[PDB]
DNA sequence: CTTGACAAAAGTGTTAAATTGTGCTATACTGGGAGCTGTCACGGATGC
């Protein structure tokens, strides 16, 4: 039924492997291309990666590379074409390094494709992560590219080594950057791994699972029960709301979760009643002090007013405002003990 | 399957351009490859050939 | 409501201590993998 994995498998199956000869030739053609770019940088006085990408623009497709980097990366007619024209002004010795360059550029692609059959075989022991087959393999191939650009054939080492070391990394990074729904930075993943590792070891030995005492003991210095327990708490991942229930296939999870982040119908009339009855009990105070109170507690502009400010527009000193709101407060305290209307709202 | 067009002084074309029946190839319009296809510039063998291809 | 003196609350600048992000490891490693059955009726796209 159109398997996505067999697609890629037979797609890499079309391009054959590479023996010693082809490999060395490839790498050499690549480094030759790159150093060619290095001289071509001195040619027109440009950068490495600049001309290097300009080469790509003419090789792995023309309009398509500059068309969808996303809405803004670099202009095609402006910062690209002028680079083509500017390097067209050069003689034999110069102009040939261009062809050398692009040749090496193709050699890089051939190299990556030839060794892809490895990267696919690398992510197979790496399954069971927070990512599936293709998702893993691709992020491994991303490591294959960097494994290519940094490789040196002069060291007489088979590329299958230097590549594999970069794949084994790229995947183990790919898990650290995806994994759990919540994002966990590298170091945390590391420490967690060490913890579970220790667990697996002393549980294999002792014939039973450890305690936060012994597991942190075996973890070395600075490791106590509280810390291992802490990182253990962070270790767990969120639970899906689509989680089924018991024997009933119909029963979901999230339908059991209440909304407390929105005011309950009772709370609406509650806050209303408070804001009303308070305004009623406020009218028994002097025109100044009553205003000063709601200016102080932010029932006016929604913000607290320092004694300095309440006194600034009233002309009175801060001390005056202070005594005013104290007095007014207790003058309210007289009526409240009587009516017992607002003696509620005590939480 | 292709058609060879050896050159002498440089070229106006690069590997991966397309083609046309008698368009300038190399050496100020010395040779013109007449055919449809992909163009390959070879410094070693000092030739710029074209393998027969439509640009579909 | 006022004037000055002061504790505490809250500010603001520089720094020590953590937390977080990035990179590389060159003997040679070169196409995964798990399978699951005792429906049933019908309606449409597709194949003989």
UniProtKB/Swiss-Prot annotation, chain A:
Q: Where is this motif: Interaction with polymerase core subunit RpoC?
A: 135-138
List localization entries.
Cytoplasm
Entry annotated with the keyword rRNA-binding: no
Residue intervals annotated as DNA-binding region are 307-326
Which intervals of the chain are annotated as region Sigma-70 factor domain-4?
A: 281-333
Q: Where is this region: Sigma-70 factor domain-1?
A: 2-37
Its cellular-component GO annotations read:
cytoplasm
Residue ranges, annotated region (Sigma-70 factor domain-2): 111-181
Family, as annotated = Belongs to the sigma-70 factor family. RpoD/SigA subfamily.
Q: What is the annotated role of this protein in its UniProt record?
A: Sigma factors are initiation factors that promote the attachment of RNA polymerase to specific initiation sites and are then released. This sigma factor is the primary sigma factor during exponential growth.
Q: How does it assemble?
A: Interacts transiently with the RNA polymerase catalytic core formed by RpoA, RpoB, RpoC and RpoZ (2 alpha, 1 beta, 1 beta' and 1 omega subunit) to form the RNA polymerase holoenzyme that can initiate transcription.
Its UniProt domain note says: Contains 4 domains, connected by flexible linkers. In the active conformation, the domains are in an extended conformation, each making extensive interactions with the RNA polymerase catalytic core. In the autoinhibited state, sigma-70 factor domain-1 packs closely together with sigma-70 factor domains-2 and -4, contrary to the extended conformation that is seen when the protein is part of the RNA polymerase holoenzyme.
What protein am I looking at?
RNA polymerase sigma factor SigA
Q: What range of the intact protein is shown?
A: 92 to 438 of 438
From Swiss-Prot, chain B:
Q: Say which domain of life the source belongs to.
A: Bacteria
Q: Which cysteines are joined by disulfide bonds?
A: none
Q: Which family does it belong to?
A: Belongs to the RNA polymerase beta' chain family.
Q: How does it assemble?
A: The RNAP catalytic core consists of 2 alpha, 1 beta, 1 beta' and 1 omega subunit. When a sigma factor is associated with the core the holoenzyme is formed, which can initiate transcription.
Write out the function statement from the record.
Answer: DNA-dependent RNA polymerase catalyzes the transcription of DNA into RNA using the four ribonucleoside triphosphates as substrates.
Name of the protein described by the UniProt record: DNA-directed RNA polymerase subunit beta'
Instruction: Report the source organism.
Output: Thermus aquaticus
Q: Which gene encodes it?
A: rpoC
Residues represented out of the complete protein: 397 to 452 of 1524
